[PDB]
Swiss-Prot record:
Protein's cellular compartments: Host cytoplasmic vesicle membrane
Organism: Poliovirus type 1 (strain Mahoney)
Superkingdom, natural source: Viruses
Activity regulation (UniProt): Replication or transcription is subject to high level of random mutations by the nucleotide analog ribavirin.
This protein's name: RNA-directed RNA polymerase
Length: 461
């Protein structure tokens, strides 16, 4: 990805956009009951904590575009991936406006809380004024589509979340690149069935895990993997994507029956952005908050890994490449050991910056003992080995519980954490519950005991 140009929005016919400048995050009732070193990310150029130019920092993710066209290895990757997907017998029909708006089997309704994007954000019109979850009205939406059309600029906000002291000091805040309600609706109508098919088929066929439920899915994953696992981390995945990778994606879509609407992918590739009083154009890079962001990054990941394996290990059997992606995150396998360090090398020629799995200093062998997916480990249950526990380290949960965005969501927030934590064992979970109950706020919460969560789990299969 690379920003072609940036200038005052007025100069190109656009209004100034208001992006919140004050974090809604602040110390929670457990701020001092648990350890933590994370704080709210920088949201404005004036934040006292900054140690470098903010603007420069948030846009530096666009490391440029390495490759220009789709080479021979990429084409092979496309054919193989498209071939697998073809077996899912995905419905290629467009999705009706109603379902694209309010949902259907395999596709959740549009999120009413998230932004309505441009121009609604500048007209003050919110999403709650356009759709009725119970009326399932599409009349208001239809007029809006006919009025403002599609391919609208993407509204950019800085994401309000916790970050390391380092990332805070270097202005490394992540950005929300929200598509207009019009594009989301249009794109969900164009790819709605593709999304549903993926959400319903997390595994090694779609090579995707978007829409999965870690509590149940973790027991299916091992069975799907080949003998030797391999993995690695990406540095600025989304932003590093070159235009060729988007073209590769269109070929897959074309081969599986969506050639009809590959133009929507162009909208992702060559994108239009609004930030504050500036507007900029990007060539390459996947927008962060577009309908399909997660699924398309995953499809592209499948193309990337297949390509690197073909470039590096000629004669490799992609039919025995068993991988599952979730955006840039990925867990993969092959009957034979492969060199991640080597793959990382080939990766640089494709505009991808790959590093050791889980922040290691060197490329070590990936095993069931140390592999993580979605920041979760894999641990067979002591009583029933065939049931696999998705284990997220307590550190993350601790960091999270020390802050709050709305005292009215304390019950949910803390309950969410409990569903993640208990997998660390009864001893750990109880220590967690006791610390929570060492202050008034925690003692008033309704939290599940270990026995309850363990039984709920066994009963969910
Ligand atoms: Na782009």
């Amino acid at each position: 990805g690379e920003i072609q140009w940036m200038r005052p929005s007025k100069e190109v016919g656009y209004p100034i956009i208001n992006a919140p400048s004050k974090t809604k995050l602040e110390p929670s009732a457990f701020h001092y009951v648990f350890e933590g070193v994370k704080e709210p990310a920088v949201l404005t150029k004036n934040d006292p904590r900054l140690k470098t130019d903010f603007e420069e920092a948030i846009f530096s993710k666009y490391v440029g575009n390495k490759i220009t066209e789709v080479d021979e290895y990429m084409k092979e990757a496309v054919d193989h991936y498209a071939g697998q997907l073809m077996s899912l017998d995905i419905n290629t029909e467009q999705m009706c406006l109603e379902d694209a708006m309010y949902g259907t089997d395999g596709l959740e309704a549009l999120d009413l809380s998230t932004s309505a994007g441009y121009p609604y954000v500048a007209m003050g019109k919110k999403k709650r004024d356009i759709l009725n979850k119970q009326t399932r009205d599409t009349k208001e939406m239809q007029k809006l589509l006919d009025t403002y059309g599609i391919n609208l600029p993407l509204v950019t906000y800085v994401k309000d979340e916790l970050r390391s002291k380092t990332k805070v000091e270097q202005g490394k805040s992540r950005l929300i690149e929200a598509s207009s309600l019009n594009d989301s609706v249009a794109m969900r109508m164009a790819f709605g069935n593709l999304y549903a098919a993926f959400h319903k088929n997390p595994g090694v066929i779609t090579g995707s895990a978007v829409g999965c439920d870690p509590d149940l899915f973790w027991s299916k994953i091992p069975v799907l993997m080949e003998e030797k696992l391999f993995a690695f981390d990406y540095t600025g995945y989304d932003a590093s994507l070159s235009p060729a990778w988007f073209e590769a994606l269109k070929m897959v879509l074309e081969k599986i029956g969506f050639g009809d609407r590959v133009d929507y992918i162009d909208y992702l590739n060559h994108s239009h952005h609004l930030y504050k009083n500036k507007t900029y154009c990007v060539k390459g890079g996947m927008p962060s908050a577009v309908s399909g962001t997660s699924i398309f990054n995953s499809m592209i990941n499948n193309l990337i890994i297949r390509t690197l394996l073909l470039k590096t290990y000629k004669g490799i059997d992609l039919d025995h490449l068993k991988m599952i992606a979730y955006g840039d995150d990925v867990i993969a396998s092959y009957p034979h050991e492969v060199d991640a360090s080597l793959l990382a090398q080939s990766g640089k020629d494709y505009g991808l910056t790959m590093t050791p799995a889980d922040k290691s200093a060197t490329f070590e062998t990936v095993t069931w003992e140390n592999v993580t997916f979605l920041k979760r480990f894999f641990r067979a249950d002591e009583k029933y080995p065939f049931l696999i526990h998705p284990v997220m380290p307590m550190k993350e949960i601790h960091e999270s519980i020390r802050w709050t965005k709305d005292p009215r969501n304390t019950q949910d927030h803390v309950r969410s954490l409990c569903l993640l934590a208990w997998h660390n064992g009864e001893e750990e979970y109880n220590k967690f519950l006791a610390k929570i109950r060492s202050v008034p706020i925690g003692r008033a919460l309704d939290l599940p005991e270990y026995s309850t969560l363990y039984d709920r789990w066994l009963d969910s299969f």
